[PDB]
């Protein structure tokens, strides 16, 4: 795990790290999921298998948790489903916070931005609500949903800046690949 950036933002300490989010030292890690919590690919698959040993198993566990928490089999942007991290609990990761970002498919707009903003802010508020002091995020919607990475990072930063909390003390954005991590760093540098 390599920390590329660190500083005080909003009400917490923000870090930009390059590495595997399933190995990040945070009490809760956020999953960039689809509205049905079917973890079939990308970071959602990585987190799902890391937690249960079989992504399919975590998908079922997640669907059950979502029905229990929201009374339905899907979530809207901003809503967060909480599941036990299972096998990751040994690493200090107690929960996985599932959030759902919009599908840009190479486009951008105020509406798409708002949906993504909610996808980032929701997990922060859930952490605050649960007294979870540390949380790590992936670049939501920057995967197959095709939202421009720079726009995604800018929106994430906006959410962190606007976030009002006292329980949450540490927040991190975790990017797996070098090329993407550097793009993110560039945004952090000119925005903070």
Helix-strand category: alpha/beta
Name of the top-level CATH class = Alpha Beta
Count of beta strands: 7
Q: What share of the residues lie within helices?
A: 25-40%
How many domains would you count in the coordinates?
Answer: 1
**Rg over C-alpha atoms, rounded to the nearest angstrom:** 15 Å
- The run of helices and strands is EEEHHEEHEHEH
CATH-assigned fold name? Leucine Aminopeptidase, subunit E, domain 1
Helical segment count: 5
Overall form: globular
Give the strand content: 15-25%
Query: How far do the termini sit from each other?
Result: 22 Å
CATH homologous superfamily?
Answer: Leucine Aminopeptidase, subunit E, domain 1
What strand line-up does the widest sheet have? 1-2-7-6-3-5-4
Give a quick account of the main beta sheet: strands, pairing sense, barrel closure.
Answer: 7 strands, mixed
Instruction: Tell me what the CATH architecture is.
Output: 3-Layer(aba) Sandwich
Domain Macro: 1-192
Catalytic activity: 5-O-(ADP-D-ribosyl)-L-glutamyl-[protein] + H2O = L-glutamyl-[protein] + ADP-D-ribose + H(+); 4-O-(ADP-D-ribosyl)-L-aspartyl-[protein] + H2O = L-aspartyl-[protein] + ADP-D-ribose + H(+); alpha-NAD(+) + H2O = ADP-D-ribose + nicotinamide + H(+)
Function: Removes ADP-ribose from aspartate and glutamate residues in proteins bearing a single ADP-ribose moiety. Inactive towards proteins bearing poly-ADP-ribose. Catalyzes removal of a phosphate group from ADP-ribose 1''-phosphate (Appr1p), but with low efficiency.
Organism: Archaeoglobus fulgidus (strain ATCC 49558 / DSM 4304 / JCM 9628 / NBRC 100126 / VC-16)
